């Protein structure tokens, strides 16, 4: 759908687990930003403003959840498009008969 | 040509602490840093590892 | 300048860019460029000095000329297609003129001469808009007309930008002129991949904007505009020097930092198309960028330059600059590589 | 022996109009 | 450019070395003029004669490298009866670099020019044989 | 709200606070000319804020707890050492004048900020506009080098241009022979070493450059030794001045907003006082710079931004 | 030490501290509420 | 590998949250504990490697390199804590952080299944190494050394990135387990000649190959001691490790493409050994000894025989412990006389009798006295190189003669003869220094009892 961040069809995909390792990483980036925010302003890095440090983790996680949801949808679309095309053009994707190594001939290159 | 701090003197760790192990200026920390290296380095890794 | 007037003009700079990006009609695209140009000149002239006047004039003459070749391309396209829709052009002369028009707007070599001079002559905050936000509108047009773009023309502009951007930065001590030649070099990467995968042009544009904003924001933080003044930062804000080092290494494209992601993904899309020589040449020539980034790190973070006695008076005063989004931007400039697959959101 | 750090003569290499 | 390059590429290697020199001298002469035009424009000469004198040097030097390469490379092909050999161009590319050194009157430049021009020329011949694409056409 | 474009938009405009009494007054004069007494008495009668003359430790008095810091944090520049050996190899003479100008520059910014934000006038003792008289006196006597003056003029050019001169320039004329005598009566052993040629150069600079220049842009009132004694008669002269010249007539709220933005940001005020010009007298090597900066952050209340140091009592740091 | 001037951040700004903590609380509730609907709609569309 | 990655990452919080005076004690104690658990990687089977997940796997090539890596971290901390005594506290914690992050990149480099994941970590090791040399080096030339180190590496690495990406397009995967079964022969053509060079030249620069080595003596003379330990012990072996992996997909083209590089190595090892005889700088001498030893490793990898790979693995481990020990010994002299000139301080066996024992043992391993694992590695390479071409025994034999000459020259020049009269600050060896040397030599000699665990996958 045109200019939609997440089209409707994406709802038939399983949403990212809130324990997604990628999401856990995004939350870690939010935490790192909070510490840097304390440092550049010469505040105690770990302790100063935990209300601020908390909004960093939340905002990164909140934004990163939907970015991950669209990331998954866009790869699902890619596979859907690709598999459908292979079905629409059987003559371009033929099923070869696989020989076994007993039959296929490969040259031997000695290491002497 | 500027305002500079001269070249600092070499400090012999032995003069203040003749029993220094060379790990730290503070004697108590110097003892602990020796024990962990020897206990973990030799008693654990090399003996139990071997 | 009145604060309300500054906000209105700044919104008109953005409005013109938005018009270019939502227009389906070539005339409205042209209007968006004129509106953007009309609103950015007063931001260049803000501090009213002979250098700002020179920069504004050189910018106006270059942008005004490029806009005229753009409109000529549009009218030729109307002649040979009888329509105004923003898409592939229907005349090879129209494509050449529009491609050159957009190269001039972007400051790509050999149309690059204005970028170092205009950037040097305007305040840091105006240079930030110039080297980041002003790239969006011309790139959004390229994104839509690339099927008709001449491959030899676009790749020649890419190659020249990387070489001239790499060589030009070697001779600079002014931070604003180092960022200008860095910009030229990075534009070459964005257009080099455009014929093959436009999604990677967007990826490179986005990450470049993040890193460029991070550097300009930290230069603005200490009000530094030269190498030597920047070398005093260690004696004022030691943290700011570590952020500059990390960001500069990222701009240089070193793993495991974010800035390696665009070079990595562009090389991938070019090798899928059996382009080996060009990406190999581009990567090696990008070592010029890494060299004059490395010098900034040496004089800023990895050594301690001589300071001055009056520097001690600054120890007693906190940083007061807004430094908006700097904590978030610096983390995005460095620690994004593990999330590279997220690039499919741009698809 | 103290670690070497840039002096005035070294720093002046970056104070010119060009490199 | 396409026409002159095609003429050089579309005649068999190592045969009719007087023609090849016409093609590589034209490429060399043209490149020298392009340098002259930008140089004259960006670095204004003090007089009309200086501007013409500068153009003559760049165009002659570039054309001389073009002729020698197209001659040295072709003569070695017939001499060695190895028409499809990158080694021929390596010699042809080096000979060009030596001329650049003499015209610039610098052994260091002449020594460096041989290595880069000889190896660059050898790579171009490999590209032609193997089908290497510089500006590859989009395929996927 | 901290002051900024938003606060200016909402109504905070300097023309609201300012009145016929929002004036910046500067008292100048040679050494031991009676400036401080006169300036302090002018301030009380007119109800103005009084800034004592900016010394070496002025900056200390505006940050932290306000007490002077050890001299190594001002660069070891010393006024006493200047009188004892003004031709010292260590360059203390110019390091002092460079430091003092920066201190005056900071006091002027503070004075202007007080005027703009509250509308109340201020009285100062010397300023960045008259600080050069000590520079010239030092040079004529050979206490500093030609390069140092060049450096001073570089810094002054890119800093004094941003500000507005005082409305009133009160000046006290005390000829050198009386200045001589008034120094011994002070009893400071270091000052008594002052030569008269040095004091004459100071006088020549004031009467040669300062007063002629400031007459075109400010109101200048000159007083003799006895004239200065009746502070009430000095205030009477101030109260009936016309005020019909100088750049203050051209100031509008747009300009005073931009000016107020500069003076509230002290690191922007002091930006160019540390330009990378490598004079021996003001250049500090990396090891000395680094070692002293480590000490500074070890001072009480100095490690963190003000309001986040719980070694001096700050609270709620986890919610700030 | 006991600062001569009142620091700009002498005491907490309880309006921002109120809005900061509330905004975090709001966003977290919104996210989990959204994640619930996403899972339920996913199962619904997929027959689960 | 998470059981090694996660604890390594935890060393960063431990250092930063450690009490001001416990940074060296805490980091040393817990990095030694991590080294202990690294022995659990010895669960190796005859046929199948140890494949943990889609991302990481461990075989008998990577396992000894992992154990050497995690062992080297505590040793680097002990060696650094004296010359960093006056450093600022937060700058101490940043120095330890650079070393911890170097270990993190190294253990993931040696266990990545896929070659692009290997490439990214292979390159990530530059950033910490560059920062250590340039930030904590001592002299002016540390800035040039960082630049030569950076650009020599990248000039080779960038072509490798292109080659690896091209391989994934054509083969479909860069997973190393997958490549073992989908490997196809490389036929003659100029396109393949440059694919071979692209795949190998990045690793050649790391070894380093003779001709491309001139960055290494620069880095060693300018690096801090910890920099020199990791650079010599492990970072050089990134090139060898990558070669032993990537040559799988370069056959049979290696049959003739190896000739220029075997000639460089065989002749280069004689040249670099002879240079060692005339070096005036003790650190430069030890640097030039690494180039000579790694020439054997290059030849062994390129001839591709079961004996040569077994010898190649043993040398990389044996060299790693010996070269690191030699750098530490020279550094202990430097920390006294503050000079790297070899002829400055003579006759030190008179003044430091026990440190002369360490000097003797390190020299004996360096010249490959049997049955040290230094000789087991050297001998296997000579055996295989003889079957490659019998004449190589002449070059191999000459190198051993010269190798003994400069190894004992260095011992004789610094430890024997008459002491230098005016150097009067030679303090008795500290317990820290004596333990530092023993933690090098004792494992190195212990491995002669069980040499199989360092012979590699072809054992
Ligand atoms: C990055 C921290 C490590 C620090 C050293 C830096 C290493 C080099 C970084 C350069 C970029 C290379 C990134 C390599 C990791 C990306 C590959 C990957 O891990 O993908 C899988 C991951 C989820 O992992 P999973 O599905 O469970 O399978 C493997 C689990 N061991 O899915 C993901 O990609 C998301 C997880 C990213 C990995 C880092 C975050 C781990 C979670 C801790 C957050 C705190
Ligand atoms: C599971 C998590 C594992 C951790 C992985 C860390 C990955 C790197 C994350 C980058 C962000 C680091 C934090 C940003 C810097 C802020 C901290 C600082 O600048 O100084 C240290 C500071 C203590 O100094 P102070 O100013 O006095 O503050 C008082 C508070 N105690 O505050 C402290 O005392 C400690 C704060 C953290 C110190 C960060 C140390 C630098 C880390 C960056 C170096 C590169 C990281 C390694 C690269 C490989 C990636 C895994
Ligand atoms: C790409 C994959 C990875 C994912 C990337 C994610 C990037 C996008 C994520 C969003 C990035 C911005 C988030 C920044 C969070 C920090 C904001 C904060 O904590 O502010 C605390 C407080 C002011 O916040 P406050 O105004 O009270 O918030 C209530 C709003 N009604 O106290 C303060 O004074 C804060 C001062 C420091 C803030 C920096 C300066 C910018 C100003 C921000 C204003 C607040 C923005 C609120 C963001 C909420 C977004 C949900
Ligand atoms: C996501 C990336 C967004 C990055 C935004 C960066 C924030 C701007 C930098 C903040 C530092 C504080 C600052 O003052 O910025 C400079 C400038 C304001 O102008 P200034 O002169 O400082 O004060 C007003 C007097 N005329 O501030 C500005 O005028 C902002 C100009 C830069 C905004 C464009 C940034 C690049 C494009 C972002 C959109 C991406 C799509
Ligand atoms: C997670 C997957 C992705 C992995 C990619 C890699 C992630 C890296 C992300 C980098 C983001 C920047 C965060 C860096 C935090 C470093 C902490 C730090 O800055 O040191 C603390 C200190 C702060 O100083 P200050 O706040 O003013 O207080 C007084 C203390 N001197 O500062 C100082 O005083 C230090 C002054 C000396 C400067 C020494 C410089 C050498 C150390 C550089 C380490 C950082 C290198 C980053 C580059 C990438 C490394 C892999
Ligand atoms: C699209 C199609 C365009 C293809 C050509 C692109 C080339 C664009 C080059 C424009 C920027 C070049 C700037 C430059 O090179 O400087 C001017 C240069 C002066 O050279 P010159 O003065 O003659 O020699 C001095 C020796 N001391 O003058 C020159 O000689 C530059 C010639 C470069 C030609 C390529
Ligand atoms: C250096 C940069 C400046 C010079 C430009 C670099 C390119 C010039 C060198 C020639 C490189 C060889 C080449 O061009 O490869 C082309 C060839 C294309 O063949 P292809 O279209 O794929 O045929 C169908 C099979 N799929 O490609 C292939 O078939 C596979 C080739 C694999 C990738 C090779 C990457 C190029 C390596 C060049 C440098 C190698 C030497 C490294 C030296 C480092 C020294 C420290
Ligand atoms: C399986 C995990 C095993 C991890 C093992 C890690 C071993 C680390 C050994 C360090 C032991 C040091 O333990 C130490 O004890 C006392 C508390 O009793 C603390 O306090 C001590 O500090 C000083 C040292 O300067 C001592 O002289 C003094 O006796 C005491 O005040 C120290 O802060 C702590 O460092
Ligand atoms: C910077 C200077 C800009 C100056 C602009 C100058 C005016 C430009 C005029 C553009 C129109 C030129 O028109 C050019 O000639 C004829 C037009 O029938 C076309 O001719 C060509 O294309 C058409 C295809 O249908 C056919 O005639 C034929 O295949 C071929 O000859 C070209 O495709 C067209 O590009
Ligand atoms: C440190 C640098 C080391 C450099 C090492 C140099 C190695 C030299 C390898 C020479 C062989 C190169 O690869 C060679 O290429 C051509 C492909 O065009 C192949 O030959 C093929 O194309 C050529 C075209 O000229 C025809 O002559 C030939 O009929 C055809 O079979 C050769 O069968 C192959 O042997
Ligand atoms: N070199 C130098 N000395 C200065 C400067 N400002 C003040 N001084 C010295 O500081 C001392 C005291 O300041 P003065 O006002 O001039 O002397 P005074 O005794 O207080 O006499 P009053 O004007 O009444 O206050 C004098 O000895 C001055 O020489 C300066 O900018 N440069
Ligand atoms: N290479 C192009 N020109 N087009 C492009 N960006 N993708 C084309 C193929 C593609 C790739 C990834 C995804 I996710 C999807 Cl949905 C589709
Ligand atoms: Mg006084």
CSV table of C-alpha atoms in Angstrom, one decimal, chain H residues 99-279:
chain,number,residue,atom,x,y,z
H,99,UNK,CA,42.5,-4.7,25.8
H,100,UNK,CA,39.2,-6.3,26.9
H,101,UNK,CA,37.6,-5.3,23.6
H,102,UNK,CA,40.5,-6.7,21.7
H,103,UNK,CA,40.0,-10.0,23.3
H,104,UNK,CA,36.3,-9.8,22.5
H,105,UNK,CA,37.0,-9.3,18.8
H,106,UNK,CA,39.7,-12.0,18.8
H,107,UNK,CA,37.7,-14.8,20.3
H,108,UNK,CA,34.8,-14.1,18.0
H,109,UNK,CA,37.2,-13.8,15.0
H,110,UNK,CA,38.6,-17.3,15.6
H,111,UNK,CA,35.2,-18.9,16.0
H,112,UNK,CA,33.0,-17.2,13.3
H,113,UNK,CA,31.6,-19.8,10.9
H,114,UNK,CA,31.0,-17.3,8.1
H,115,UNK,CA,33.8,-15.5,6.4
H,116,UNK,CA,32.1,-12.1,6.3
H,117,UNK,CA,31.5,-12.3,10.1
H,118,UNK,CA,35.2,-13.3,10.3
H,119,UNK,CA,36.1,-10.3,8.1
H,120,UNK,CA,34.2,-7.8,10.2
H,121,UNK,CA,35.9,-8.9,13.4
H,122,UNK,CA,39.2,-9.5,11.6
H,123,UNK,CA,39.0,-5.7,10.8
H,124,UNK,CA,37.5,-4.6,14.1
H,125,UNK,CA,40.7,-5.6,15.8
H,126,UNK,CA,42.4,-2.6,14.1
H,127,UNK,CA,40.5,0.1,16.1
H,128,UNK,CA,41.7,-1.0,19.6
H,129,UNK,CA,45.2,-1.8,18.4
H,130,UNK,CA,45.5,1.5,16.6
H,131,UNK,CA,44.3,3.4,19.7
H,132,UNK,CA,46.7,1.6,22.0
H,133,UNK,CA,49.7,2.3,19.9
H,134,UNK,CA,49.0,5.9,19.3
H,135,UNK,CA,47.4,7.0,22.6
H,136,UNK,CA,49.7,5.1,24.9
H,137,UNK,CA,52.9,4.7,22.8
H,138,UNK,CA,55.8,6.8,24.1
H,139,UNK,CA,57.6,8.5,21.2
H,140,UNK,CA,56.8,10.8,18.3
H,141,UNK,CA,56.9,8.0,15.7
H,142,UNK,CA,53.9,6.2,17.2
H,143,UNK,CA,51.7,8.4,15.0
H,144,UNK,CA,53.4,7.3,11.8
H,145,UNK,CA,53.4,3.7,13.0
H,146,UNK,CA,49.7,3.8,13.5
H,147,UNK,CA,49.2,5.1,10.0
H,148,UNK,CA,51.4,2.4,8.4
H,149,UNK,CA,49.7,-0.3,10.4
H,150,UNK,CA,46.3,1.0,9.4
H,151,UNK,CA,46.8,1.5,5.7
H,152,UNK,CA,49.0,-1.6,5.1
H,153,UNK,CA,46.2,-3.7,6.6
H,154,UNK,CA,43.3,-1.9,4.7
H,155,UNK,CA,45.1,-1.9,1.4
H,156,UNK,CA,44.8,-5.6,1.5
H,157,UNK,CA,41.6,-6.0,3.5
H,158,UNK,CA,39.4,-4.0,1.1
H,159,UNK,CA,40.1,-6.2,-1.9
H,160,UNK,CA,39.3,-9.2,0.3
H,161,UNK,CA,35.9,-7.8,1.2
H,162,UNK,CA,35.1,-7.6,-2.6
H,163,UNK,CA,36.4,-11.1,-3.2
H,164,UNK,CA,34.4,-12.6,-0.3
H,165,UNK,CA,31.2,-10.9,-1.4
H,166,UNK,CA,31.7,-12.1,-4.9
H,167,UNK,CA,32.2,-15.7,-3.6
H,168,UNK,CA,28.9,-15.6,-1.8
H,169,UNK,CA,27.1,-14.4,-5.0
H,170,UNK,CA,28.5,-17.3,-7.0
H,171,UNK,CA,28.6,-20.0,-4.3
H,172,UNK,CA,25.5,-18.8,-2.4
H,173,UNK,CA,27.0,-19.0,1.1
H,174,UNK,CA,30.2,-18.0,2.9
H,175,UNK,CA,29.6,-20.4,5.8
H,176,UNK,CA,32.8,-22.4,6.3
H,177,UNK,CA,31.0,-25.7,7.0
H,178,UNK,CA,29.0,-25.2,3.8
H,179,UNK,CA,32.1,-24.3,1.7
H,180,UNK,CA,33.7,-27.6,2.7
H,181,UNK,CA,31.0,-29.4,0.6
H,182,UNK,CA,30.3,-26.9,-2.1
H,183,UNK,CA,33.9,-26.1,-2.9
H,184,UNK,CA,34.5,-26.1,-6.7
H,185,UNK,CA,37.9,-26.1,-8.4
H,186,UNK,CA,39.4,-22.8,-9.5
H,187,UNK,CA,40.4,-22.9,-13.2
H,188,UNK,CA,43.1,-20.8,-14.9
H,189,UNK,CA,42.0,-17.3,-16.0
H,190,UNK,CA,43.0,-13.7,-15.1
H,191,UNK,CA,39.7,-13.3,-13.3
H,192,UNK,CA,40.7,-16.1,-11.0
H,193,UNK,CA,44.3,-14.9,-10.6
H,194,UNK,CA,43.1,-11.7,-9.1
H,195,UNK,CA,40.4,-13.5,-7.0
H,196,UNK,CA,43.3,-15.5,-5.6
H,197,UNK,CA,45.3,-12.4,-4.8
H,198,UNK,CA,42.4,-10.7,-3.3
H,199,UNK,CA,41.7,-13.6,-1.0
H,200,UNK,CA,45.3,-14.0,0.1
H,201,UNK,CA,47.0,-10.6,0.2
H,202,UNK,CA,45.1,-9.3,3.2
H,203,UNK,CA,46.4,-12.3,5.1
H,204,UNK,CA,49.9,-11.9,3.6
H,205,UNK,CA,50.2,-8.4,5.0
H,206,UNK,CA,49.2,-9.7,8.5
H,207,UNK,CA,51.7,-12.5,8.6
H,208,UNK,CA,53.6,-10.4,7.4
H,209,UNK,CA,55.0,-11.6,4.1
H,210,UNK,CA,58.6,-10.5,3.2
H,211,UNK,CA,58.4,-7.3,1.2
H,212,UNK,CA,55.1,-6.2,2.9
H,213,UNK,CA,56.6,-6.4,6.4
H,214,UNK,CA,58.1,-3.0,6.9
H,215,UNK,CA,55.1,-1.9,9.0
H,216,UNK,CA,55.7,-4.5,11.6
H,217,UNK,CA,59.1,-3.2,12.9
H,218,UNK,CA,57.6,0.2,13.1
H,219,UNK,CA,54.6,-0.8,15.2
H,220,UNK,CA,56.7,-2.9,17.6
H,221,UNK,CA,59.3,-0.1,18.3
H,222,UNK,CA,56.4,2.3,19.1
H,223,UNK,CA,53.8,0.2,20.8
H,224,UNK,CA,53.4,-0.1,24.6
H,225,UNK,CA,54.4,-3.4,26.0
H,226,UNK,CA,50.8,-4.8,25.9
H,227,UNK,CA,50.5,-3.7,22.3
H,228,UNK,CA,53.6,-5.6,21.4
H,229,UNK,CA,52.5,-8.7,23.2
H,230,UNK,CA,49.1,-9.0,21.5
H,231,UNK,CA,50.5,-7.8,18.2
H,232,UNK,CA,53.2,-10.5,18.2
H,233,UNK,CA,51.4,-13.2,20.0
H,234,UNK,CA,47.9,-13.2,18.4
H,235,UNK,CA,47.4,-10.4,15.8
H,236,UNK,CA,50.1,-11.8,13.5
H,237,UNK,CA,48.3,-15.2,13.6
H,238,UNK,CA,45.1,-13.7,12.2
H,239,UNK,CA,46.7,-13.8,8.8
H,240,UNK,CA,47.9,-17.4,9.2
H,241,UNK,CA,44.5,-18.5,10.6
H,242,UNK,CA,42.7,-16.9,7.7
H,243,UNK,CA,45.0,-18.5,5.2
H,244,UNK,CA,44.5,-22.0,6.6
H,245,UNK,CA,40.8,-21.4,6.1
H,246,UNK,CA,40.5,-19.7,2.8
H,247,UNK,CA,43.0,-21.9,0.8
H,248,UNK,CA,40.3,-24.5,0.9
H,249,UNK,CA,38.4,-22.7,-1.9
H,250,UNK,CA,41.5,-21.7,-4.0
H,251,UNK,CA,42.6,-25.1,-5.3
H,252,UNK,CA,44.2,-26.1,-7.6
H,253,UNK,CA,45.2,-22.5,-8.5
H,254,UNK,CA,47.4,-22.5,-5.4
H,255,UNK,CA,49.6,-25.0,-7.2
H,256,UNK,CA,51.2,-22.2,-9.3
H,257,UNK,CA,50.1,-19.0,-7.7
H,258,UNK,CA,52.0,-19.9,-4.6
H,259,UNK,CA,55.4,-19.8,-6.3
H,260,UNK,CA,56.1,-16.1,-6.0
H,261,UNK,CA,55.2,-16.2,-2.3
H,262,UNK,CA,57.2,-19.3,-1.5
H,263,UNK,CA,60.3,-17.6,-3.1
H,264,UNK,CA,59.7,-14.5,-1.1
H,265,UNK,CA,59.3,-16.5,2.1
H,266,UNK,CA,62.2,-18.9,1.6
H,267,UNK,CA,64.6,-16.1,0.7
H,268,UNK,CA,62.9,-13.6,2.9
H,269,UNK,CA,63.5,-15.7,6.0
H,270,UNK,CA,67.2,-15.7,5.3
H,271,UNK,CA,67.3,-12.0,4.7
H,272,UNK,CA,65.3,-11.1,7.9
H,273,UNK,CA,67.4,-13.5,10.0
H,274,UNK,CA,70.6,-11.8,8.8
H,275,UNK,CA,69.1,-8.4,9.5
H,276,UNK,CA,68.7,-9.5,13.1
H,277,UNK,CA,72.5,-9.8,13.3
H,278,UNK,CA,72.9,-6.0,12.8
H,279,UNK,CA,70.0,-4.5,14.7
